Amino acid sequence: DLTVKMLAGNEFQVSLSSSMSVSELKAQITQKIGVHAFQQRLAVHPSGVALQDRVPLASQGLGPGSTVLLVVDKCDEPLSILVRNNKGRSSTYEVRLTQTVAHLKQQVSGLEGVQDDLFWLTFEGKPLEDQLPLGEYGLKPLSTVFMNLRL
């Protein structure tokens, strides 16, 4: 088990499987308190040194009984992306990483004039899921999301 400590000194517990990855810990945290992975900044306690992603937690001096510090970064600043319709036409959208895929789909629906249930969006091969935030997918300024039509 692992203690997560937040800025105000409140603490909660996370139990980690045999992977013991930083990405695993972050997913646990999201499940426990709802803070999306992309918003989590984690550090070792009490040293405050940032956790490293590509390194197992056992390798960074975190084992059972240890404490990690979480600071939440909301990541709400506007950026612009591109959504390509089925005809090959890209169009720009102002977004924020905290907005849901569903919200972006409302924007694409409005511009393209296609009902949201009749399409889905992809990015770098994988589908975007309605309930997840855009920050989940690591979208950058002018990344291209593709629009795919349902039957």
């Binding site: 937040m6 800025l7 105000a8 308190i33 918003q39 600071v71 939440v72 970064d73 909301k74």
Partner: peptide, 9 residues
């Protein structure tokens, strides 16, 4: 204030 607020504090 805003950044603090994201810490649920």
């Amino acid at each position: 204030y805003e950044r603090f607020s994201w810490q649920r504090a």
